UniProtKB/Swiss-Prot annotation, chain A:
Organism annotation: Saccharomyces cerevisiae (strain ATCC 204508 / S288c)
DNA-binding residues (ranges): 1-60
Covered range of the whole protein: 123 to 280 of 328
The family this protein is said to belong to: Belongs to the TFIIE beta subunit family.
Protein name: Transcription initiation factor IIE subunit beta
Domain of life: Eukaryota
Subunit comment: TFIIE is a tetramer of two alpha (TFA1) and two beta (TFA2) subunits.
Function noted in UniProt: Recruits TFIIH to the initiation complex and stimulates the RNA polymerase II C-terminal domain kinase and DNA-dependent ATPase activities of TFIIH. Both TFIIH and TFIIE are required for promoter clearance by RNA polymerase.
Further details from the record: Present with 1150 molecules/cell in log phase SD medium.
Cellular compartment(s): Nucleus
Signal sequence interval, chain numbering: none
From Swiss-Prot, chain B:
UniProt miscellaneous comment: Present with 520 molecules/cell in log phase SD medium.
Organism listed in the record: Saccharomyces cerevisiae (strain ATCC 204508 / S288c) (Baker's yeast)
Assembly notes: TFIIF is composed of three different subunits: TFG1/RAP74, TFG2/RAP30 and TAF14.
Lineage of the organism: Eukaryota, Fungi, Dikarya, Ascomycota, Saccharomycotina
Gene: TFG2
Family: Belongs to the TFIIF beta subunit family.
Intracellular or extracellular location(s): Nucleus
Main function: TFIIF is a general transcription initiation factor that binds to RNA polymerase II. Its functions include the recruitment of RNA polymerase II to the promoter bound DNA-TBP-TFIIB complex, decreasing the affinity of RNA polymerase II for non-specific DNA, allowing for the subsequent recruitment of TFIIE and TFIIH, and facilitating RNA polymerase II elongation.
Annotated protein name in UniProt: Transcription initiation factor IIF subunit beta
Curated annotation (Swiss-Prot), chain C:
Name of protein: Transcription initiation factor IIE subunit alpha
Keyword terms, alphabetized: Metal-binding, Nucleus, Transcription, Transcription regulation, Zinc, Zinc-finger
Highest taxon above the source species: Eukaryota
Cystine residue pairs: none
Lineage: Eukaryota, Fungi, Dikarya, Ascomycota, Saccharomycotina
Quaternary data: TFIIE is a tetramer of two alpha (TFA1) and two beta (TFA2) subunits.
Annotated compartments: Nucleus
Organism this protein belongs to: Saccharomyces cerevisiae (strain ATCC 204508 / S288c) (Baker's yeast)
Miscellaneous field: Present with 35900 molecules/cell in log phase SD medium.
Gene from which the chain derives: TFA1
Amino acid sequence: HDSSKLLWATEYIQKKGKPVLVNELLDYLSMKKDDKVIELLKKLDRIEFDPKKGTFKYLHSPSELLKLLRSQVTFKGISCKDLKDGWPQCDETINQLEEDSKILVLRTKKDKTPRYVWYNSGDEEFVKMWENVQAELPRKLQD
Amino acid sequence: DYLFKLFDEYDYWSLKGLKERTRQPEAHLKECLDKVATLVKKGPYAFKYTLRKEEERKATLGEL
Amino acid sequence: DDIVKNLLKFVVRGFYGGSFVLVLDAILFHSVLAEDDLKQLLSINKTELGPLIARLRSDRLISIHKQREYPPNSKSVERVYYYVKYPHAIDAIKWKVHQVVQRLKDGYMCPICLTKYTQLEAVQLLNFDRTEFLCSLCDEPLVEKQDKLNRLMDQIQPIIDSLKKIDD
């Protein structure tokens, strides 16, 4: 049951609006002085561990999204909100990369105001002209 | 904090058992449990949450 | 297979939306997948993967081998092998582009009757008493692009040049 302490401490770091010493946390959070509370802060990406004494602080978006897609080259899907959390206010950058048609975005089939962003592995008249009717002998005649 | 002590006391429990204890709507109980506990929908214990310091968590709850 | 991948990306730009293009690129990243691998790889569901799979089946874009993994643990294993077939895709794209060009290369109607007439019907429908084209049964009055198709054809011309480069 070590998962809850990190969130009550971090949301407290948001409420206090300033970094809190591990001892100040352990006294305010009334815990035995321990490395695990710091280690959860060393583990958690929403909190910054400071090399000077104790200090714990709470915690380029288009480039970050492009790097995430490149790392994602093995992954065929990602979550929209998680990318936004990694790069705060990345939904707009994701939509812009979409409009550019590179990191392209996929408009929400659930709530039409939302949009998902996806990772890039990198008209019906036009489409039917590009498709029409779709055999082997005309292909050989084509070949 | 009390519900967590139940989770060490019981590896499996229900929103009904929790609502009976906490006298709160199961919907609220289901939200926080998603954070601490996870649900198993298969087996004899199906539809019951299983866990993954407790005193530190209780003091954190008291602070917040 | 870079040229084939570029032709597939051009086909994704021409045919359908971006999600299908991304699924094709994901298949391109990983060598072989069996029927469940896109679902693990993608955040889309299997039923919706099914509508997309039906759309791919409608065309010649890719190919499916249907194989069972024999080892008798329970019901064994339904593994499907999706491998792109280049010749069928080349033939279908050529037929579509040529048919599109033929369509680009390629009138009278009565309001109440909702009939339709042509030039030969014009010679028949002409009356000497008045000056007009009259309907046959109802005797009602008769009423009733290439450059724009040529510009859209400029988009078709880059694809044709890419196909020529892929051929040689």
